[PDB]
Amino acid sequence: NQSSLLAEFGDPITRVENALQALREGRGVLLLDDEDRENEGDIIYAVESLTTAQMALMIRECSGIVCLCLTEAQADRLALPPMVVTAFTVSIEAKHGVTTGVSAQDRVTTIKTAANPQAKPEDLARPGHVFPLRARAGGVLARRGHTEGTVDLMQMAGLQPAGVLCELTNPDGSMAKTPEIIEFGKLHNMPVLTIEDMVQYRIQFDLKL
Amino acid sequence: NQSSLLAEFGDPITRVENALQALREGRGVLLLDDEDRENEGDIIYAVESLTTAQMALMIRECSGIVCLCLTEAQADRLALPPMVVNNNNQTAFTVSIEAKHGVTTGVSAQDRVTTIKTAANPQAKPEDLARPGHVFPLRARAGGVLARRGHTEGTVDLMQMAGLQPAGVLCELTNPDGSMAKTPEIIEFGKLHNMPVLTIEDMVQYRIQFDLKL
Ligand SMILES: O=C(CO)[C@H](O)[C@H](O)COP(=O)(O)O
Numbered sequence A: 001n002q003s004s005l006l007a008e009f010g011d012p013i014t015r016v017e018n019a020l021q022a023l024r025e026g027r028g029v030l031l032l033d034d035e036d037r038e039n040e041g042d043i044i045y046a047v048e049s050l051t052t053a054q055m056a057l058m059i060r061e062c063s064g065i066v067c068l069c070l071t072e073a074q075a076d077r078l079a080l081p082p083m084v085v086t087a088f089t090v091s092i093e094a095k096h097g098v099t100t101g102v103s104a105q106d107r108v109t110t111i112k113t114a115a116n117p118q119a120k121p122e123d124l125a126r127p128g129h130v131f132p133l134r135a136r137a138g139g140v141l142a143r144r145g146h147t148e149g150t151v152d153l154m155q156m157a158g159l160q161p162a163g164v165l166c167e168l169t170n171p172d173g174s175m176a177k178t179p180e181i182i183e184f185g186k187l188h189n190m191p192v193l194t195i196e197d198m199v200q201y202r203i204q205f206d207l208k209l
Numbered sequence B: 001n002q003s004s005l006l007a008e009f010g011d012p013i014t015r016v017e018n019a020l021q022a023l024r025e026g027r028g029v030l031l032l033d034d035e036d037r038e039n040e041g042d043i044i045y046a047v048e049s050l051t052t053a054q055m056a057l058m059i060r061e062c063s064g065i066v067c068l069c070l071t072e073a074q075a076d077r078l079a080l081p082p083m084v085v086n087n088n089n090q091t092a093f094t095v096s097i098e099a100k101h102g103v104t105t106g107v108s109a110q111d112r113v114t115t116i117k118t119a120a121n122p123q124a125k126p127e128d129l130a131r132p133g134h135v136f137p138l139r140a141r142a143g144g145v146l147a148r149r150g151h152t153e154g155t156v157d158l159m160q161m162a163g164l165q166p167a168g169v170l171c172e173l174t175n176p177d178g179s180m181a182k183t184p185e186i187i188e189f190g191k192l193h194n195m196p197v198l199t200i201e202d203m204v205q206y207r208i209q210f211d212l213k214l
Protein backbone atom coordinates (compact mmCIF):
# COMPACT_ATOMS: atom_id res chain seq x y z
CA ASN A 1 0.00 0.00 0.00
CA GLN A 2 3.06 2.29 0.12
CA SER A 3 3.29 1.13 -3.50
CA SER A 4 -0.31 2.22 -3.99
CA LEU A 5 0.21 5.56 -2.20
CA LEU A 6 3.18 6.28 -4.50
CA ALA A 7 1.19 5.51 -7.68
CA GLU A 8 0.54 9.20 -8.41
CA PHE A 9 4.31 9.59 -8.84
CA GLY A 10 4.19 6.75 -11.44
CA ASP A 11 5.44 3.15 -11.49
CA PRO A 12 8.80 2.26 -9.90
CA ILE A 13 10.91 2.92 -13.03
CA THR A 14 9.13 6.20 -13.71
CA ARG A 15 9.60 7.23 -10.08
CA VAL A 16 13.38 6.86 -10.58
CA GLU A 17 13.40 8.53 -13.98
CA ASN A 18 11.62 11.62 -12.71
CA ALA A 19 13.89 11.85 -9.64
CA LEU A 20 16.92 11.71 -11.99
CA GLN A 21 15.53 14.49 -14.17
CA ALA A 22 14.64 16.68 -11.14
CA LEU A 23 18.23 16.35 -9.96
CA ARG A 24 19.56 17.18 -13.44
CA GLU A 25 17.35 20.28 -13.25
CA GLY A 26 18.83 21.30 -9.85
CA ARG A 27 15.71 20.41 -7.89
CA GLY A 28 15.44 18.15 -4.92
CA VAL A 29 13.75 14.79 -4.41
CA LEU A 30 12.39 12.77 -1.50
CA LEU A 31 13.80 9.31 -0.98
CA LEU A 32 12.18 6.70 1.26
CA ASP A 33 14.02 3.65 2.56
CA ASP A 34 12.44 0.26 3.31
CA GLU A 35 9.35 0.32 5.53
CA ASP A 36 10.93 -2.23 7.82
CA ARG A 37 14.26 -0.31 7.92
CA GLU A 38 14.19 3.38 8.99
CA ASN A 39 10.89 4.08 7.20
CA GLU A 40 12.03 7.67 6.81
CA GLY A 41 11.87 10.08 3.91
CA ASP A 42 14.91 12.31 3.30
CA ILE A 43 15.14 15.43 1.18
CA ILE A 44 17.99 14.92 -1.27
CA TYR A 45 19.83 17.61 -3.25
CA ALA A 46 22.75 17.52 -5.64
CA VAL A 47 25.82 19.33 -4.26
CA GLU A 48 26.65 20.89 -7.64
CA SER A 49 23.38 22.85 -7.88
CA LEU A 50 23.02 23.37 -4.11
CA THR A 51 21.79 26.77 -2.96
CA THR A 52 21.36 28.62 0.31
CA ALA A 53 17.59 28.51 -0.20
CA GLN A 54 17.67 24.71 -0.59
CA MET A 55 19.79 24.35 2.55
CA ALA A 56 17.47 26.66 4.45
CA LEU A 57 14.53 24.42 3.50
CA MET A 58 16.33 21.36 4.88
CA ILE A 59 17.06 23.10 8.13
CA ARG A 60 13.50 24.40 8.55
CA GLU A 61 11.70 21.20 7.49
CA CYS A 62 14.06 18.37 8.45
CA SER A 63 16.10 17.18 11.45
CA GLY A 64 18.72 19.86 10.82
CA ILE A 65 21.46 17.20 10.96
CA VAL A 66 22.28 17.74 7.30
CA CYS A 67 24.66 15.13 5.92
CA LEU A 68 27.01 15.10 2.94
CA CYS A 69 27.05 11.69 1.22
CA LEU A 70 30.46 11.14 -0.39
CA THR A 71 32.13 8.30 -2.17
CA GLU A 72 34.83 6.49 -0.25
CA ALA A 73 37.38 7.96 -2.71
CA GLN A 74 36.31 11.51 -1.91
CA ALA A 75 36.15 10.86 1.83
CA ASP A 76 39.68 9.35 1.63
CA ARG A 77 40.89 12.33 -0.39
CA LEU A 78 39.65 14.54 2.48
CA ALA A 79 41.37 12.38 5.10
CA LEU A 80 38.02 11.91 6.80
CA PRO A 81 38.26 8.88 9.05
CA PRO A 82 35.08 7.44 10.72
CA MET A 83 33.84 9.40 13.73
CA VAL A 84 34.15 6.18 15.77
CA VAL A 85 36.50 3.19 15.58
CA THR A 86 25.93 4.53 9.22
CA ALA A 87 29.42 5.66 8.19
CA PHE A 88 29.64 9.04 9.92
CA THR A 89 33.05 10.64 9.58
CA VAL A 90 34.38 13.26 11.90
CA SER A 91 32.35 16.44 11.34
CA ILE A 92 33.66 19.29 9.15
CA GLU A 93 33.72 23.03 8.60
CA ALA A 94 35.11 25.22 5.81
CA LYS A 95 38.13 27.22 6.98
CA HIS A 96 37.43 30.07 4.58
CA GLY A 97 34.30 32.08 3.78
CA VAL A 98 32.24 31.11 6.86
CA THR A 99 31.73 32.39 10.43
CA THR A 100 30.19 29.93 12.91
CA GLY A 101 29.53 27.28 10.26
CA VAL A 102 25.89 26.73 11.12
CA SER A 103 24.02 29.20 8.85
CA ALA A 104 22.51 27.81 5.64
CA GLN A 105 25.14 29.66 3.60
CA ASP A 106 27.98 28.44 5.83
CA ARG A 107 26.86 24.82 5.55
CA VAL A 108 26.64 25.12 1.76
CA THR A 109 30.13 26.70 1.60
CA THR A 110 31.41 23.82 3.73
CA ILE A 111 29.68 21.33 1.49
CA LYS A 112 30.96 22.79 -1.80
CA THR A 113 34.50 22.90 -0.34
CA ALA A 114 34.38 19.22 0.66
CA ALA A 115 32.73 18.00 -2.57
CA ASN A 116 35.33 19.71 -4.81
CA PRO A 117 37.08 16.96 -6.80
CA GLN A 118 40.38 18.91 -6.23
CA ALA A 119 39.72 19.29 -2.48
CA LYS A 120 42.41 18.82 0.15
CA PRO A 121 42.10 17.67 3.79
CA GLU A 122 43.35 21.08 4.94
CA ASP A 123 40.43 22.83 3.21
CA LEU A 124 38.33 21.51 6.14
CA ALA A 125 38.44 22.20 9.85
CA ARG A 126 37.25 19.36 12.16
CA PRO A 127 34.92 19.11 14.07
CA GLY A 128 32.12 21.21 12.51
CA HIS A 129 28.48 21.46 11.50
CA VAL A 130 28.34 19.37 8.31
CA PHE A 131 28.26 15.58 8.80
CA PRO A 132 29.83 13.56 6.01
CA LEU A 133 28.80 9.96 5.33
CA ARG A 134 30.83 7.39 3.32
CA ALA A 135 28.65 5.65 0.75
CA ARG A 136 29.49 1.95 0.60
CA ALA A 137 30.88 0.58 -2.69
CA GLY A 138 28.11 -0.89 -4.83
CA GLY A 139 25.58 1.66 -3.62
CA VAL A 140 21.98 0.53 -3.08
CA LEU A 141 22.69 -2.95 -4.47
CA ALA A 142 25.16 -3.40 -1.57
CA ARG A 143 23.59 -1.37 1.25
CA ARG A 144 20.03 -0.12 1.18
CA GLY A 145 20.67 3.22 2.93
CA HIS A 146 19.72 6.78 2.03
CA THR A 147 23.49 7.46 1.91
CA GLU A 148 23.91 5.03 -0.96
CA GLY A 149 20.68 6.12 -2.63
CA THR A 150 22.04 9.66 -2.56
CA VAL A 151 25.31 8.92 -4.30
CA ASP A 152 23.71 6.47 -6.82
CA LEU A 153 21.12 9.05 -7.81
CA MET A 154 23.81 11.59 -8.67
CA GLN A 155 25.80 8.96 -10.59
CA MET A 156 22.72 7.65 -12.36
CA ALA A 157 21.82 11.24 -13.27
CA GLY A 158 25.35 11.84 -14.68
CA LEU A 159 26.15 14.39 -11.98
CA GLN A 160 28.97 15.06 -9.55
CA PRO A 161 28.80 12.07 -7.19
CA ALA A 162 28.04 14.00 -4.01
CA GLY A 163 24.69 14.79 -2.43
CA VAL A 164 23.18 16.07 0.79
CA LEU A 165 20.38 14.44 2.79
CA CYS A 166 18.28 15.22 5.77
CA GLU A 167 15.24 13.45 7.28
CA LEU A 168 11.80 15.09 6.89
CA THR A 169 10.40 15.84 10.35
CA ASN A 170 6.81 16.80 11.22
CA PRO A 171 6.24 20.04 13.24
CA ASP A 172 5.62 18.06 16.41
CA GLY A 173 9.00 16.33 16.08
CA SER A 174 7.81 12.94 14.87
CA MET A 175 9.34 11.61 11.68
CA ALA A 176 7.35 12.14 8.47
CA LYS A 177 5.54 9.12 7.04
CA THR A 178 4.60 8.31 3.46
CA PRO A 179 1.38 10.44 3.39
CA GLU A 180 3.21 13.53 4.72
CA ILE A 181 6.15 12.89 2.41
CA ILE A 182 3.83 12.68 -0.53
CA GLU A 183 2.07 15.94 0.43
CA PHE A 184 5.44 17.69 1.01
CA GLY A 185 6.61 16.48 -2.42
CA LYS A 186 3.56 17.80 -4.22
CA LEU A 187 3.80 21.18 -2.44
CA HIS A 188 7.52 21.51 -3.24
CA ASN A 189 7.57 20.03 -6.76
CA MET A 190 9.85 17.21 -5.54
CA PRO A 191 9.46 13.65 -6.88
CA VAL A 192 9.16 10.86 -4.36
CA LEU A 193 10.79 7.47 -4.80
CA THR A 194 11.95 4.50 -2.76
CA ILE A 195 15.24 2.64 -2.36
CA GLU A 196 13.53 -0.50 -3.74
CA ASP A 197 12.55 1.51 -6.85
CA MET A 198 16.27 2.31 -7.28
CA VAL A 199 17.33 -1.28 -6.76
CA GLN A 200 14.91 -2.53 -9.46
CA TYR A 201 15.86 0.25 -11.86
CA ARG A 202 19.63 -0.36 -11.62
CA ILE A 203 19.13 -4.06 -12.48
CA GLN A 204 16.41 -3.48 -15.09
CA PHE A 205 18.79 -1.18 -16.98
CA ASP A 206 22.02 -3.11 -16.27
CA LEU A 207 23.31 -0.06 -14.34
CA LYS A 208 26.73 -0.93 -13.01
CA LEU A 209 27.93 2.61 -12.25
CA ASN B 1 22.85 48.55 20.74
CA GLN B 2 22.45 45.29 22.70
CA SER B 3 22.23 46.85 26.17
CA SER B 4 19.28 49.11 25.35
CA LEU B 5 17.48 46.37 23.42
CA LEU B 6 17.83 43.98 26.38
CA ALA B 7 16.83 46.56 29.02
CA GLU B 8 13.12 45.62 28.63
CA PHE B 9 14.02 42.18 30.04
CA GLY B 10 15.39 44.12 33.03
CA ASP B 11 18.84 44.92 34.36
CA PRO B 12 21.60 42.30 34.09
CA ILE B 13 20.98 40.80 37.54
CA THR B 14 17.24 40.62 36.92
CA ARG B 15 17.84 39.00 33.52
CA VAL B 16 19.79 36.23 35.25
CA GLU B 17 17.22 35.79 38.05
CA ASN B 18 14.35 35.50 35.58
CA ALA B 19 16.26 32.90 33.54
CA LEU B 20 17.12 30.91 36.66
CA GLN B 21 13.45 30.99 37.68
CA ALA B 22 12.34 29.89 34.17
CA LEU B 23 14.64 26.86 34.38
CA ARG B 24 13.43 25.99 37.91
CA GLU B 25 9.89 26.01 36.47
CA GLY B 26 10.83 23.62 33.62
CA ARG B 27 10.81 26.28 30.90
CA GLY B 28 13.43 27.38 28.36
CA VAL B 29 15.63 30.47 28.09
CA LEU B 30 17.58 32.24 25.34
CA LEU B 31 21.29 32.76 25.90
CA LEU B 32 23.42 35.21 23.86
CA ASP B 33 27.22 35.05 23.79
CA ASP B 34 29.45 38.07 23.08
CA GLU B 35 28.72 40.17 19.99
CA ASP B 36 32.38 39.89 18.96
CA ARG B 37 32.32 36.11 19.44
CA GLU B 38 29.61 33.96 17.76
CA ASN B 39 26.96 36.65 18.37
CA GLU B 40 24.26 33.93 18.44
CA GLY B 41 21.31 33.15 20.71
CA ASP B 42 20.74 29.58 21.83
CA ILE B 43 17.57 28.10 23.21
CA ILE B 44 18.53 26.44 26.51
CA TYR B 45 16.58 23.76 28.39
CA ALA B 46 17.23 21.85 31.60
CA VAL B 47 17.59 18.15 30.92
CA GLU B 48 15.71 17.10 34.01
CA SER B 49 12.41 18.68 32.83
CA LEU B 50 13.04 18.24 29.06
CA THR B 51 9.94 17.34 27.02
CA THR B 52 9.26 16.12 23.50
CA ALA B 53 7.51 19.41 22.71
CA GLN B 54 10.54 21.42 23.83
CA MET B 55 12.82 19.31 21.67
CA ALA B 56 10.36 19.64 18.79
CA LEU B 57 10.49 23.45 19.03
CA MET B 58 14.32 23.39 18.83
CA ILE B 59 14.12 21.19 15.77
CA ARG B 60 11.64 23.59 14.07
CA GLU B 61 13.22 26.90 15.01
CA CYS B 62 16.91 26.18 15.58
CA SER B 63 19.82 24.64 13.64
CA GLY B 64 18.66 21.12 14.49
CA ILE B 65 22.12 20.27 15.81
CA VAL B 66 20.88 19.92 19.36
CA CYS B 67 23.78 19.62 21.78
CA LEU B 68 23.95 18.18 25.26
CA CYS B 69 26.11 20.16 27.69
CA LEU B 70 27.79 17.93 30.28
CA THR B 71 30.34 18.30 33.06
CA GLU B 72 33.74 16.77 32.23
CA ALA B 73 33.04 14.21 34.96
CA GLN B 74 29.72 13.15 33.36
CA ALA B 75 31.31 12.96 29.93
CA ASP B 76 34.13 10.80 31.36
CA ARG B 77 31.75 8.35 33.01
CA LEU B 78 30.05 7.94 29.60
CA ALA B 79 33.42 7.32 27.87
CA LEU B 80 32.96 10.45 25.74
CA PRO B 81 36.32 12.13 25.13
CA PRO B 82 36.71 15.03 22.64
CA MET B 83 35.60 13.96 19.08
CA VAL B 84 38.85 15.38 17.75
CA VAL B 85 42.24 15.34 19.50
CA ASN B 86 43.54 18.42 17.62
CA ASN B 87 40.45 20.66 17.57
CA ASN B 88 40.64 23.37 14.87
CA ASN B 89 36.02 28.74 19.38
CA GLN B 90 37.41 25.30 20.44
CA THR B 91 33.90 23.84 20.83
CA ALA B 92 34.28 20.65 22.91
CA PHE B 93 32.34 18.12 20.82
CA THR B 94 32.53 14.50 21.85
CA VAL B 95 31.54 11.70 19.53
CA SER B 96 27.81 11.83 18.78
CA ILE B 97 25.52 9.49 20.72
CA GLU B 98 22.24 7.56 20.65
CA ALA B 99 20.43 5.65 23.37
CA LYS B 100 21.30 1.95 23.10
CA HIS B 101 17.68 1.11 23.96
CA GLY B 102 14.31 2.81 23.80
CA VAL B 103 14.76 4.56 20.44
CA THR B 104 14.39 3.66 16.77
CA THR B 105 16.32 5.89 14.34
CA GLY B 106 17.37 8.39 17.01
CA VAL B 107 16.34 11.53 15.18
CA SER B 108 12.73 12.14 16.29
CA ALA B 109 12.13 14.64 19.09
CA GLN B 110 11.13 11.80 21.44
CA ASP B 111 14.24 9.72 20.63
CA ARG B 112 16.60 12.69 21.18
CA VAL B 113 14.97 13.33 24.55
CA THR B 114 15.41 9.61 25.41
CA THR B 115 19.13 9.72 24.40
CA ILE B 116 19.64 12.95 26.38
CA LYS B 117 18.06 11.70 29.61
CA THR B 118 19.97 8.42 29.22
CA ALA B 119 23.27 10.33 28.82
CA ALA B 120 22.65 12.89 31.58
CA ASN B 121 21.82 10.25 34.17
CA PRO B 122 24.52 10.55 36.87
CA GLN B 123 24.38 6.73 37.26
CA ALA B 124 24.83 6.27 33.54
CA LYS B 125 27.25 3.65 32.20
CA PRO B 126 29.05 3.85 28.81
CA GLU B 127 27.06 0.87 27.41
CA ASP B 128 23.78 2.84 27.85
CA LEU B 129 24.85 4.76 24.71
CA ALA B 130 25.60 3.74 21.14
CA ARG B 131 28.05 5.88 19.11
CA PRO B 132 27.81 7.66 16.69
CA GLY B 133 24.31 9.16 16.80
CA HIS B 134 22.09 12.20 16.51
CA VAL B 135 22.71 13.93 19.88
CA PHE B 136 25.90 16.01 20.20
CA PRO B 137 27.49 16.09 23.63
CA LEU B 138 29.65 19.07 24.63
CA ARG B 139 32.23 19.09 27.48
CA ALA B 140 31.81 22.18 29.60
CA ARG B 141 35.11 23.59 30.94
CA ALA B 142 35.72 23.44 34.70
CA GLY B 143 35.03 26.88 36.17
CA GLY B 144 32.19 27.58 33.75
CA VAL B 145 31.70 31.02 32.24
CA LEU B 146 34.66 32.30 34.32
CA ALA B 147 36.83 29.75 32.46
CA ARG B 148 35.29 30.07 28.98
CA ARG B 149 32.65 32.55 27.78
CA GLY B 150 30.68 29.96 25.78
CA HIS B 151 27.07 28.85 25.56
CA THR B 152 28.37 25.41 26.63
CA GLU B 153 29.53 26.72 30.03
CA GLY B 154 26.58 29.13 30.29
CA THR B 155 24.26 26.11 30.06
CA VAL B 156 25.93 24.12 32.79
CA ASP B 157 26.38 27.18 35.02
CA LEU B 158 22.70 28.12 34.65
CA MET B 159 21.66 24.64 35.80
CA GLN B 160 24.01 24.73 38.80
CA MET B 161 22.90 28.28 39.70
CA ALA B 162 19.24 27.21 39.56
CA GLY B 163 19.97 24.17 41.74
CA LEU B 164 19.27 21.55 39.03
CA GLN B 165 21.07 18.55 37.50
CA PRO B 166 24.18 20.12 35.81
CA ALA B 167 23.12 19.07 32.32
CA GLY B 168 21.35 21.15 29.67
CA VAL B 169 20.64 21.25 25.98
CA LEU B 170 21.25 24.07 23.54
CA CYS B 171 20.58 24.85 19.94
CA GLU B 172 21.18 28.03 17.92
CA LEU B 173 18.08 29.99 16.95
CA THR B 174 17.82 30.20 13.14
CA ASN B 175 15.76 32.59 11.00
CA PRO B 176 13.28 31.23 8.45
CA ASP B 177 15.77 32.10 5.64
CA GLY B 178 18.59 29.96 7.10
CA SER B 179 20.61 32.84 8.54
CA MET B 180 21.28 32.90 12.28
CA ALA B 181 19.08 34.99 14.58
CA LYS B 182 20.56 38.19 16.04
CA THR B 183 19.46 40.15 19.11
CA PRO B 184 16.29 41.69 17.65
CA GLU B 185 15.00 38.34 16.38
CA ILE B 186 16.05 36.58 19.61
CA ILE B 187 14.15 39.22 21.62
CA GLU B 188 11.02 38.76 19.47
CA PHE B 189 11.30 34.98 19.78
CA GLY B 190 11.57 35.29 23.59
CA LYS B 191 8.49 37.49 23.82
CA LEU B 192 6.53 35.16 21.52
CA HIS B 193 7.43 31.94 23.35
CA ASN B 194 7.78 33.29 26.89
CA MET B 195 11.53 32.70 27.25
CA PRO B 196 13.77 35.03 29.20
CA VAL B 197 16.73 36.46 27.27
CA LEU B 198 20.15 36.93 28.89
CA THR B 199 23.82 37.13 27.93
CA ILE B 200 27.03 35.45 28.99
CA GLU B 201 28.21 38.82 30.31
CA ASP B 202 25.08 38.88 32.54
CA MET B 203 26.08 35.45 33.89
CA VAL B 204 29.71 36.46 34.45
CA GLN B 205 28.74 39.62 36.38
CA TYR B 206 26.07 37.77 38.36
CA ARG B 207 28.52 35.09 39.37
CA ILE B 208 31.16 37.63 40.45
CA GLN B 209 28.58 39.78 42.27
CA PHE B 210 27.11 36.84 44.19
CA ASP B 211 30.36 35.17 45.08
CA LEU B 212 29.08 32.18 43.09
CA LYS B 213 32.14 29.94 42.90
CA LEU B 214 30.19 26.75 42.05
O1 LIG C 1 21.38 8.40 10.19
C1 LIG C 1 21.11 9.19 9.29
C2 LIG C 1 22.10 10.26 8.93
O2 LIG C 1 22.20 11.17 10.02
C3 LIG C 1 19.81 9.12 8.55
O3 LIG C 1 19.01 8.03 9.05
C4 LIG C 1 20.01 9.03 7.03
O4 LIG C 1 18.82 8.54 6.38
C5 LIG C 1 21.21 8.20 6.55
O5 LIG C 1 21.12 6.86 6.98
P1 LIG C 1 21.13 5.60 5.96
O6 LIG C 1 22.19 5.78 4.90
O7 LIG C 1 21.48 4.52 6.94
O8 LIG C 1 19.75 5.48 5.35
Ligand SMILES: O=C(CO)[C@H](O)[C@H](O)COP(=O)(O)O
Pocket (backbone or CB within 6 Å): A100, B033, B038, B042, B065, B067, B089, B090, B091, B136, B149, B150, B151, B152, B153, B170, B172
Ligand atom coordinates in the same frame (compact mmCIF):
# COMPACT_ATOMS: atom_id res chain seq x y z
O1 LIG D 1 29.00 24.96 17.87
C1 LIG D 1 27.91 25.01 18.41
C2 LIG D 1 27.19 23.76 18.81
O2 LIG D 1 27.29 22.81 17.76
C3 LIG D 1 27.26 26.32 18.77
O3 LIG D 1 27.95 27.42 18.14
C4 LIG D 1 27.30 26.35 20.28
O4 LIG D 1 26.77 27.58 20.79
C5 LIG D 1 28.74 26.17 20.73
O5 LIG D 1 28.74 26.78 21.99
P1 LIG D 1 29.93 27.64 22.63
O6 LIG D 1 29.33 29.02 22.73
O7 LIG D 1 30.11 26.88 23.92
O8 LIG D 1 31.09 27.53 21.70
